[PDB]
Design an enzyme around this catalytic site. Structure first.
Site, PDB file in Angstrom:
ATOM      1  N   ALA A   1       0.609  -1.067  -0.069  1.00  0.00           N
ATOM      2  CA  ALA A   1       0.136   0.059  -0.034  1.00  0.00           C
ATOM      3  C   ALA A   1       0.807   1.041  -0.045  1.00  0.00           C
ATOM      4  O   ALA A   1       1.679   1.291   0.884  1.00  0.00           O
ATOM      5  CB  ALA A   1      -0.877  -0.271   1.271  1.00  0.00           C
TER       6      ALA A   1
ATOM      7  N   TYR B   1       8.284  11.166  -3.414  1.00  0.00           N
ATOM      8  CA  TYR B   1       7.962   9.653  -3.616  1.00  0.00           C
ATOM      9  C   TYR B   1       9.106   8.729  -3.258  1.00  0.00           C
ATOM     10  O   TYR B   1       9.159   7.680  -2.248  1.00  0.00           O
ATOM     11  CB  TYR B   1       7.354   9.285  -4.913  1.00  0.00           C
ATOM     12  CG  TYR B   1       7.279   7.745  -5.181  1.00  0.00           C
ATOM     13  CD1 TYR B   1       6.374   7.070  -4.916  1.00  0.00           C
ATOM     14  CD2 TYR B   1       8.418   7.074  -5.899  1.00  0.00           C
ATOM     15  CE1 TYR B   1       6.238   5.826  -4.970  1.00  0.00           C
ATOM     16  CE2 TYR B   1       8.088   5.571  -6.151  1.00  0.00           C
ATOM     17  CZ  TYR B   1       7.213   5.018  -5.708  1.00  0.00           C
ATOM     18  OH  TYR B   1       7.283   3.592  -5.857  1.00  0.00           O
TER      19      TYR B   1
END
Ligand SMILES: NC(=O)c1ccc[n+]([C@@H]2O[C@H](COP(=O)([O-])OP(=O)(O)OC[C@H]3O[C@@H](n4cnc5c(N)ncnc54)[C@H](O)[C@@H]3O)[C@@H](O)[C@H]2O)c1
Ligand SMILES: NC(=O)c1ccc[n+]([C@@H]2O[C@H](COP(=O)([O-])OP(=O)(O)OC[C@H]3O[C@@H](n4cnc5c(N)ncnc54)[C@H](O)[C@@H]3O)[C@@H](O)[C@H]2O)c1
Ligand SMILES: O=c1ccn([C@@H]2O[C@H](COP(=O)(O)OP(=O)(O)O[C@H]3O[C@H](CO)[C@@H](O)[C@H](O)[C@H]3O)[C@@H](O)[C@H]2O)c(=O)[nH]1
Ligand SMILES: O=c1ccn([C@@H]2O[C@H](COP(=O)(O)OP(=O)(O)O[C@H]3O[C@H](CO)[C@H](O)[C@H](O)[C@H]3O)[C@@H](O)[C@H]2O)c(=O)[nH]1
Lengths: 310, 311
Positions: B78, B146
């Protein structure tokens, strides 16, 4: 310069504010009083060059704050600072130390800020390192959530440096001590000892008392922040310490000798997350910044104790 | 074993769930459908070895979930996966990828979990290293939020390993492609090309089209997750890729060939956060895990294009 100091109501933060004002800068202080104290800044009530903003780095509109004040350099000292608390609630520690830093970077890159001077943790980020004293070239190996968040903060600012050219340097102090360190916490051993020994209240060391730290006086650390605020050491960490190890037991003896009275700490169980040894190689700060610590432990302890006596 | 997979409704996650079930494990899937799709798991409706929990790793009571389901291994997939979105909203990306990971670790260390297999990003964490193919020994140098958050997650899990002996390994894939990758996703060039070239809709390449990635087929990635879930490679990252570079332009040509139509992309400006080269040294995975990729790009693209035709 126009400076902004997050964690300005804190021990190191309030001391940095003073130095910056003394050097003739204008200073915006920012704090939410999580661990900071209004008394640390109350002497500034009528100082013309300081303004205070009460704000939480995790949730405040940092964009709007930076847009208004347009600081050239942000000294980022706001953080959850207790290693044991970071173990008890790693999520909260990560929110303050990682998310807070990310939000600050994202605001700063949009508001013409030149440089963020981050506060990392030289004393903990290396974990158990390959050698002591430890150089910045040693790999980080954090063994507490606190240490992990400080590393992550470095990495995020480095990333913003790549993305936007928002400059950054990481001041990585060892164990900082001196006036204004909160005497009523579980972190800040020098202040804990001084306060308790002056009051004739019980003191303690953890485990067998043999843990070492590298004790560096607050004024020296503050000087490192000032030097690194210029266009020097972009993307780099600088260890800020003395490169000398003092055991918990030796520290207790030094403080007791300064206070007078007994040198008889209780011994308590070891604290999960606490490293056994910590000692920083400070060669890089010497060469690059011309930084060297001035205050030896014995001198520093005296000054600290004398500050708590009054 | 009892396994739990976060990101289970996603591309790699749903595929991993399938493999774990095939191997005879019980599998709890967990997802909040930020980017996932119900259709990825719909075939499992009647499989009693599978339970699905809708949950946001940022806010859900993960302690209670793990206490109930008692997984031996957590496969953590996730995440906010889009580099551009991370640049646009670094806070949100950090909340999911860092805070999310921390909450999972904190829950897992309290509920008897043996190991967390984290998903890092081999493709992005190294930035511009001097070595290609890039070994795990190369310093990380993220150039997007990220990538930063992915590194941050590795470090946090390493920390929980020191603190509690909660074992961890970091699967660090290159560029993963294959069946179930979202065709309308903002990311996933192979799917994006197949969806557009199949629809006869416009395609594009960024910069001059020379930027390279290392394209690894999903089934190969899934196998790495399985291998590393054992008591091995503790606190180590494993690069999972092919160790071969394909330029943006070259991939377009390779998908265009599979589709059959014209090979004529538009050239759009570089995207802030994107790297120019990516290629992983996969030696450690071979030596330690016995893992090697089976699927060459040509075969994988064909299988993928074929999946898209079936719909
Ligand atoms: N004291 C040391 O030995 C030492 C050494 C290495 C690193 N550091 C770092 O130096 C910095 C200063 O620590 P200190 O020793 O002065 O402790 P401190 O607690 O006195 O200072 C931290 C300050 O940050 C503030 N703060 C915390 N969370 C905040 C939030 N969400 N929003 C706004 N303000 C917030 C606190 O209220 C406090 O005023 C911290 O980043 C700490 O991690 C300290
Ligand atoms: N696809 C690649 O090329 C590639 C390469 C390296 C790393 N990765 C990593 O692999 C993992 C899986 O990515 P993917 O390609 O399958 O993409 P995906 O979007 O299909 O899968 C991610 C899944 O995570 C779920 N998710 C997101 N935020 C969540 C949250 N807060 N709570 C619960 N679930 C949440 C999404 O709904 C989705 O189902 C991610 O960690 C990604 O960063 C992907
Ligand atoms: O009553 C006490 C308190 C502490 N200690 C010892 O003193 C040392 C230092 O402990 P503490 O003052 O809590 O600091 P650290 O946990 O070492 O961390 C401090 O120093 C780090 C840098 O090394 C900073 O990053 C942290 O913010 C700061 O809290 C340790 O060896 C403790 O065992 C005692 O013996 N008695
Ligand atoms: O229409 C497009 C889209 C992309 N590209 C090129 O294809 C390559 C791959 O881009 P993707 O967006 O598919 O993936 P990234 O390389 O940005 O990979 C990132 O997004 C992935 C999600 O699919 C993973 O999360 C991975 O870890 C992360 O680095 C890039 O060189 C890009 O320029 C094109 O040519 N045309």
């Amino acid at each position: 310069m126009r400076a902004l100091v997050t964690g300005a109501a804190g021990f190191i933060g309030s001391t940095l504010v003073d130095r910056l004002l003394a050097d003739g800068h204008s200073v915006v202080g920012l704090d939410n009083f999580a661990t900071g104290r209004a008394t640390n800044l109350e002497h500034l009530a009528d100082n013309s060059a300081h303004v205070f903003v009460e704000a939480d780095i995790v949730t405040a509109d940092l964009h709007a704050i930076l847009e208004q004040h347009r600081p050239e350099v942000v000294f980022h000292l706001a953080a959850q600072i207790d290693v044991r608390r970071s173990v008890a609630d790693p999520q909260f520690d990560a929110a303050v130390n990682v998310i807070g830093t990310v939000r600050l970077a994202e605001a700063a890159r949009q508001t013409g800020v030149r440089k963020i001077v981050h506060t990392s943790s030289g004393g903990s980020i290396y974990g158990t390192p390959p050698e002591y004293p430890t150089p910045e070239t040693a790999p980080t190996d954090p063994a507490s959530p606190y240490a992990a968040g400080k590393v992550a903060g470095e990495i995020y600012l480095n990333t913003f440096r790549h993305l936007y050219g928002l400059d950054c340097s990481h001041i990585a102090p060892a164990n900082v001590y001196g006036p204004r360190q909160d005497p009523h916490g579980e972190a800040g051993v020098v202040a804990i000892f001084a306060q308790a020994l002056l009051s004739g209240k019980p003191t303690r060391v953890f485990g067998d008392g043999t843990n070492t730290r590298d004790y560096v006086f607050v004024d020296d650390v503050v000087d490192a922040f000032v030097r690194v605020s210029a266009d020097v050491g972009g993307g780099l960490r600088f260890n800020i310490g003395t490169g000398k190890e003092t055991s918990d037991r030796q520290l207790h003896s030094a403080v007791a000798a300064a206070v007078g009275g007994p040198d008889d700490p209780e011994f308590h169980p070891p604290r999960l997350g606490d490293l056994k040894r910590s000692c920083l190689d400070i060669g890089l700060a010497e060469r690059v910044l011309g930084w060297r610590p001035q205050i030896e432990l014995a001198d520093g302890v005296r000054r600290t104790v004398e500050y708590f006596r009054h």
